Design a binder for this molecule. Sequence first.
Ligand SMILES: [Mg+2]
Lengths: 522, 505
Amino acid sequence: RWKHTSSLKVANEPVLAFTQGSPERDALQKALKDLKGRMEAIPCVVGDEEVWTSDVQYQVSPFNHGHKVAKFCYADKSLLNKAIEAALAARKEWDLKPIADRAQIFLKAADMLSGPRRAEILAKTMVGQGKTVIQAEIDAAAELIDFFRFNAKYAVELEGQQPISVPPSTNSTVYRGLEGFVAAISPFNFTAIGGNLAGAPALMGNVVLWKPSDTAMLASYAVYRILREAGLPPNIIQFVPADGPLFGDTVTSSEHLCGINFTGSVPTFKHLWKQVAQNLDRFHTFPRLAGECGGKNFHFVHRSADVESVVSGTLRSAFEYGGQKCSACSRLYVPHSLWPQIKGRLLEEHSRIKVGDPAEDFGTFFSAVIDAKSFARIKKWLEHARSSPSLTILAGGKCDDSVGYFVEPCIVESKDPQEPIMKEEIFGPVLSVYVYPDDKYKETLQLVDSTTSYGLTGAVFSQDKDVVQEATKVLRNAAGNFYINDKSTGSIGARASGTNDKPGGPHYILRWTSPQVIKETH
Amino acid sequence: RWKHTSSLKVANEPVLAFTQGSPERDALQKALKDLKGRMEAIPCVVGDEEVWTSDVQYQVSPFNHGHKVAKFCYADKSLLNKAIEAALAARKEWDLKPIADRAQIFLKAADMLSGPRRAEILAKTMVGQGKTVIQAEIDAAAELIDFFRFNAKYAVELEGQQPISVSTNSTVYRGLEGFVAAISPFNFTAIGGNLAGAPALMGNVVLWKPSDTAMLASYAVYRILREAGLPPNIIQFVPADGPLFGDTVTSSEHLCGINFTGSVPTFKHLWKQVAQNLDRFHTFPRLAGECGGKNFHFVHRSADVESVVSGTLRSAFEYGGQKCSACSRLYVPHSLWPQIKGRLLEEHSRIKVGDPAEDFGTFFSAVIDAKSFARIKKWLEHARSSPSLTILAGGKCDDSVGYFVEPCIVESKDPQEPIMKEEIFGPVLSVYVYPDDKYKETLQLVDSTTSYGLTGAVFSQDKDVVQEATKVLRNAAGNFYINDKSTGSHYILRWTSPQVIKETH
Ligand SMILES: [Mg+2]
């Protein structure tokens, strides 16, 4: 007896340079010109059906909010329930489809995004979300494309992890999708498509109701359409934008919820968790919860640090994409002795940072923030820096929302390590600095940890190897992705993989399968 | 550059025969006598302090409940808090110890349980939990010794990653920040070695609230762990009232996990409690629950009768049906029923219930406690009085000396009857006879009536029916057996939080 099986090897997607005069840069110019003055009417999609509700919404271009880039609509309770019923009816066949065949769909999609549709996806994230070319490219390759390929590899390989059969028994493991539907959730004004939120569970034989982010609707739908064109069957991913609280209430009330794959705030994730608990007796299976949230990320500097590494790494981490990354640095700890040199260089380099239209100027460092709500929040923080007796704005500080949601990169010194601006997430281009006494570095390391609530990333700058070892221990639970002499947002498995994707991590892909052990005796 | 990798080759612990004249039987007979008429005094242990409270409790022998086998005590709130504080103070150094060092303790402990402590652990589980010799042996080798060894291997290999060279990159597998509660209910049947042990191995500290009904054996494993080099305050040995313990740990801002085994409703209760309390915790607690189900054997007309009969009786009645994986419902086609029924009753009459320590011929002994006995007794009266149910064999019980229940076989004319659906965790097997040409409809019925799908089995000589049944029942059981019994014949990842460290040179 014998069975045909498959194996899969994958390389990371290269990140293109887009050099002045290069060809990808040519196609991107064309894609961007394609979006200028254009809007897409994006329906909810249940099965192969396009559905409209009267609850119409608009995505605008962050750097030109006069430009409505998309019109969509919020699903209502009725539509969501139909989406659920149709997904459930499709699930069993999808679950039973061989993993090699499911993988092939995601590999096709990856290849489409890598080549024919790369310009399209980049342009839609640039125009629709305010990404610069380099930011959009990095995200397209390391996050979206790499996750499709490396998930597929992981799934195919997992399939090959099989028990040795010890006769008179034949043993095998079947990697079942979860029984029910998975809800994939990102916040209404999130800065990411979060394609992996629906993509990972789908790949593993699940069905998904995907509530994408309002502020990423254009690009999110572009990914959905590509998955479908690549051969994703109907009712595997339901495309269902919706009010955040309504979507949450509906899926956690469903007896058929088997999972929530969430990115967003800790309070929101806590709310969903509580709702699942409240309804625990009503579910046909125990829902699995996956939450990526946090955090107020830090760079700690020791007096032995390379000043230019600090300054370069910190400006980039704090201000790339307007500091709108889950991993962005928003707090800097510097020793009194090194502060004058660092402060000086920070300010000089701050002056080089170009803020503007990323489509018009590829020299742009970062662009407007995501939406009006975020512009408002950040402005309040700027006002707080300019008024609190503990706070001094050292650079930037101004904002203007007349054409786009534009905020200058802002550097703020705090005399108080416990100041709200040191502890609360702004998700904006606002860097706080605490200058600590050189004889108190050890104590300050402990301070970084103790003032860390939901710490995602962090970095230590130090040439002193002893200090690095010390910090690595003290800060062991102050950051999931921890960097030594590099920036907290990382640098250039999936290239954008990290703590959350590793075994034991909340987004480890194995969480979307329930292994069944089958044992046959002869 | 280059590095050594580290791995661990591990073989399964052999299961001994205990034949008359064998050294292991000689050793066990000796350990059993030592327990006769003796009561161990088992304290709470916090760090290295043995601590008594006034809330004294007793473990008794299920088959001879006049025999107190252990005296112990329940931790109060003050002691639990003290145990939490002391464990938290010890956690960072334990977490930082290399995994090889931690794994070594568990390997030593497994080797001790394998050799010089084997007779002890077997005797303590027999006398204390009512297990027969082979049941005690299978459990020690599998749920205790193999778990220690294989978990150690998985942990050690977890740090066996690709070499990264100067821009270096590695993953550090951190224990969870806080303490983990290891909980099993006061009258559950588990020793709990792997409940407390798995999270400890992964660099966590643990408050372990063992089952009262298994206290003697549980403390024996605790002591062996410490003797093997487990440092103080890594596992706190804290028997306690179930509700008090659950309330205390879930009210603690430092809870980072609950590793539980017991009933689904109790697990759901703890799950709800953690969620209600979510706002206080410094990290999101992780919960794990290993629970029982209403497990099935499905028979197709082509099945081998003797296999069906032997497999079903063994799965239903070994350890009195007190296994999470035990068969409690049997589905049989009309054409095979007369043959299957007749053989079931003939074999049933040969099942000896008695003292497992005094009589090694015993098939199974008393059930674990009075609450279980009462629950079982109510199902027996339900079987007797319900219009839809006929007791085919057994049905009696007697708690005058031990919690003795005859193995019971019941036929249900209704596939939706409570006895077909509700977990009894006892020696009660329910049978539904289905029309031969409705086997398709019946397969779906097995699945639709499955609330918790732990294990199951299909008996069929027809390969085409096997393939069919596996698809239909895909979600009716996590352990699925073909022509074998439902009790048989990467989990540790929940207790670690990976950190990725990247350095630019
Ligand atoms: Mg990610």
